[PDB]
Amino acid sequence: TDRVSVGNLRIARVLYDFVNNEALPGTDIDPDSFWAGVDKVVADLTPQNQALLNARDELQAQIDKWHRRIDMDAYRQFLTEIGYLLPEPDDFTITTSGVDAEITTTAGPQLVVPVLNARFALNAANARWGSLYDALYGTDVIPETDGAEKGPTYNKVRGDKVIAYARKFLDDSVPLSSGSFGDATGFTVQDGQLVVALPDKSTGLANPGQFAGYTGAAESPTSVLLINHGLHIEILIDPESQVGTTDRAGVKDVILESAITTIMDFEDSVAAVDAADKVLGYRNWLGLNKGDLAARVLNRDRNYTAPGGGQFTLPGRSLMFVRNVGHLMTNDAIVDTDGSEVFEGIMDALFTGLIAIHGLKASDLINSRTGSIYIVKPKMHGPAEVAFTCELFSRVEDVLGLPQNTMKIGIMDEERRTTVNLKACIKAAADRVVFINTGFLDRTGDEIHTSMEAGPMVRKGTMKSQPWILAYEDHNVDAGLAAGFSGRAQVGKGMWTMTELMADMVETKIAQPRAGASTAWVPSPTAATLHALHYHQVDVAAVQQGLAGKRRATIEQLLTIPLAKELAWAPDEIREEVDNNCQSILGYVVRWVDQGVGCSKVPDIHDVALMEDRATLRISSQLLANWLRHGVITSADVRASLERMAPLVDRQNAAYRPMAPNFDDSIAFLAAQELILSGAQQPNGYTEPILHRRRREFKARAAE
């Protein structure tokens, strides 16, 4: 066996060498002190980690029996009796300190990217700045009506619409004293203020404070930098450029400050099932903190001249979080003496936290300037599970020699037992917490699994509008604002998965900042630059203070189970949900299992590209597992559907292995089936157990 004994642990050698040879040098941490720390932390914390996991099963079993023997007073009383619904703590204010401004103050988009893909992770870190011309010209925010269609070459009819769109943005964000930007013919900086040339007059900024800087000579600058609600707009000025030639002010582009923070994902969008997989993950995370990851390279910072005349710089990179995995899974990258696998979550803290120290120091220019290590922790259930994550970070800080509370924690509110105790979860981390975020996809899967025995749920799509989720979204903001999150921590909302439907994202996702969210999740750098628009039209700081003190969601609203009313569907409706669910499951799982791809675009039954990840997978299989459980469909239907959709997914992928015609010969196909047929028996509906096992089994038979 290629393992390394360290006390009670047997470290997979690939991981052993990587830490010693790549992650520890630079940190001043003695390798044997590190590995005695791993050993000791694993030994001391693994038992409660397991106790907490058993707490989950015991609660779900009591809820199961309860349903099997719809009064809300009784339900609330029973949940209280079994310790599911814990009392509300007294009002309080978080004490988290040492946090960078991108999280305390600035409201804006938040990109999430799979850390196992270096080209993506680089573009995400770079997406702090994004071309708005590119985002309007490339997507459907400029519709492709007659004459405005994208071709192989530039469509100036379309590009002129792009200019016109952006001009209206400039007018509505950084207004002139009089006139419009569309009538601009030039820009100069004189006596520290910005003067815009109009045809017949010459106006300046209504709020000249919105003037932030410029590059080049003030006599005629190369760009003009503006600020509005804490976010920067940079007008690029280049007449002999291709777009600028046509522009009335020689404007070449409008750069938006976009992905303020980026989450490098080790969880639901990657497939890492062994030390080989985690080491690729960790290595990329290291190359991000060290600054030297190259596929494409991290951008330098941006240089400006202040309106006064001095120089200054702004970060060229998005402030990086890392999303660890949660308390459930173990990974054989480390086994113990008895052969038991070590909990993956404990390992990510040790290893991503260690690696993140490189981001606190100068790179051959930094991540956090204030000394924090920003860790999203997902899939927690209740305040005890938070206090445990806190304790884990405390022991890792000791092993790493970091000051206490260096390791900050972005709380995912995405599990029902966290929602209905959210105040207490925020309090458990009152000195560590940097955001709460509504992980609404995960949170729907737990909604289905928790009440699986109560009856059939409503269709997947009906769920984004059910009472419980509207209540959960408001309750989240109310709790964050109440804990004093405004000006201290982020209040975050969820991912826009329709990667191609950018006109719809620009039309509807504005709902999130309007709901008091200082950040919300985007799937691409482009989506971040287009979601940046909403923070220029919504004053989130104002919105949050208008909200402060409100209580908009009662406990009964949150506990409104999404049961389907009595005989609410026709055959064509039931079949379509099944077909649409089976195809999303298949199209995702087949790339997970056969190729180790943790996120990919899979077009639903209506041909809309949906960015799929493990959370949308938990919804699909849990819903179908629930309809199967309550008679809505037969096992014939599930198999017919899985078989009808399998060859379509083959077509959409046509170096990959088809699933049809020999379905029971495809490991990926059998995994899809198991996720459904076993779905009711996976803990809390979690898909990693089936996914990790089937991925491991494909890698093994591929090696033989």
Return the active site residues.
323, 613
Q: How far is the CB of 442 from ligand GXM (least distance, A)?
A: 3
**3-state secondary structure string across 277-303:** HHHHHHHHHHHHHHCCCECCECCCCEE
296 labelled ligand-binding: yes
323 labelled ligand-binding: yes
Judged by beta carbon, residue 301 or residue 539, the one nearer Mg ion is 539
Q: How far is the CB of 108 from ligand GXM (least distance, A)?
A: 17
Judged by beta carbon, residue 304 or residue 440, the one nearer ligand GXM is 440
Judged by beta carbon, residue 75 or residue 440, the one nearer ligand GXM is 440
Q: Are strands 261-265 and 251-257 parallel, antiparallel or unpaired?
A: unpaired
| Cα–Cα dist 356/103, whole Å | 17
Q: If 0-12 CB within 10 Å is exposed, 13-18 middle and 19+ buried, where does residue 511 land?
A: middle
Judged by beta carbon, residue 99 or residue 615, the one nearer Mg ion is 615
Site residue total, ligand GXM (CB under 6 A): 19
Judged by beta carbon, residue 497 or residue 519, the one nearer ligand GXM is 497
3-class DSSP state of 156 = helix
Q: Interaction with Mg ion in 596-615: which residues (CB under 5 A)?
A: 615
Judged by beta carbon, residue 383 or residue 523, the one nearer ligand GXM is 523
Nearest Cα to Cα of residue 235 among 225, 245, 244, 250: 225
Question: Phi-psi region for residue 521, left (φ > 0), alpha (ψ -120 to 50) or beta?
Answer: beta
Nearest Cα to Cα of residue 19 among 2, 37, 35: 35
Q: How far is the CB of 147 from Mg ion (least distance, A)?
A: 34
Helix or strand holding residue 305 (H, E): strand 302-305
With CB under 6 A as the contact rule, the residue among 131, 269, 419, 687 that binds ligand GXM is 269
With CB under 6 A as the contact rule, the residue among 397, 414, 473, 579 that binds ligand GXM is 414
Beta-carbon count within 10 A of 273 CB: 26
Q: How far is the CB of 577 from ligand GXM (least distance, A)?
A: 19
440 labelled ligand-binding: yes
Residue number with the shortest CB distance to Mg ion?
442
Complete DSSP assignment for 383-396:
HHHHHHHHHHHHHH
Nearest Cα to Cα of residue 403 among 349, 457, 357: 357
Choose the contact partner of 611 out of Mg ion, ligand GXM, none; CB within 5 to 8 A by kind.
ligand GXM
| Cα–Cα dist 31/320, whole Å | 26
Cα-to-chain-centroid distance, residue 68: 36
Nearest Cα to Cα of residue 544 among 575, 509, 576, 517: 517
Beta-carbon count within 10 A of 432 CB: 25
441 labelled ligand-binding: yes
442 labelled ligand-binding: yes
| Cα–Cα dist 526/113, whole Å | 13
Judged by beta carbon, residue 159 or residue 494, the one nearer ligand GXM is 494
With CB under 6 A as the contact rule, the residue among 41, 42, 94, 112 that binds ligand GXM is 112
Tell whether residue 109 is a contact of ligand GXM (CB under 6 A).
Answer: no
| Cα–Cα dist 4/31, whole Å | 13
Tell whether residue 415 is a contact of Mg ion (CB under 5 A).
Answer: no
Q: How far is the CB of 539 from Mg ion (least distance, A)?
A: 6
Judged by beta carbon, residue 108 or residue 494, the one nearer ligand GXM is 494
CA dihedral 82, 84, 87, 90 (to 10 degrees): 150
Q: How far is the CB of 374 from ligand GXM (least distance, A)?
A: 15
269 labelled ligand-binding: yes
Task: Tell me the CA end-to-end span of the chain in Å, nearest whole number.
Answer: 18
Q: Interaction with ligand GXM in 496-515: which residues (CB under 6 A)?
A: 497
Choose the contact partner of 269 out of ligand GXM, Mg ion, none; CB within 5 to 8 A by kind.
ligand GXM
Q: How far is the CB of 458 from Mg ion (least distance, A)?
A: 21
Say if CB 383 and CB 424 are below 8 A apart: yes
- Binding mask of the shown chain, residues 614 to 643, with x at each position contacting ligand GXM by CB under 6 A: -xx---------------------------
608 labelled ligand-binding: no
120 labelled ligand-binding: yes
Choose the contact partner of 494 out of Mg ion, ligand GXM, none; CB within 5 to 8 A by kind.
ligand GXM
Tell whether residue 441 is a contact of ligand GXM (CB under 6 A).
Answer: yes
Nearest Cα to Cα of residue 229 among 508, 538, 509, 527: 538
- Binding mask of the shown chain, residues 437 to 476, with x at each position contacting Mg ion by CB under 5 A: --x--x----------------------------------
Q: How far is the CB of 14 from Mg ion (least distance, A)?
A: 28
Residue whose tokens read 């157990």: 689
| Cα–Cα dist 153/668, whole Å | 41
With CB under 6 A as the contact rule, the residue among 442, 446, 594, 650 that binds ligand GXM is 442
CB-based contacts of 73, cutoff 8 Å, min separation 6: none
Binding residues for acetyl-CoA: 112, 119-120, 269, 296, 523
Binding residues: 112, 119-120, 269, 296, 323, 414, 439-442, 523
Binding site for ligand GXM (CB under 6 A): 112, 265, 268-269, 414, 439-442, 494-495, 497, 521, 523, 599, 611, 613, 615-616
Binding site for Mg ion (CB under 5 A): 439, 442, 615
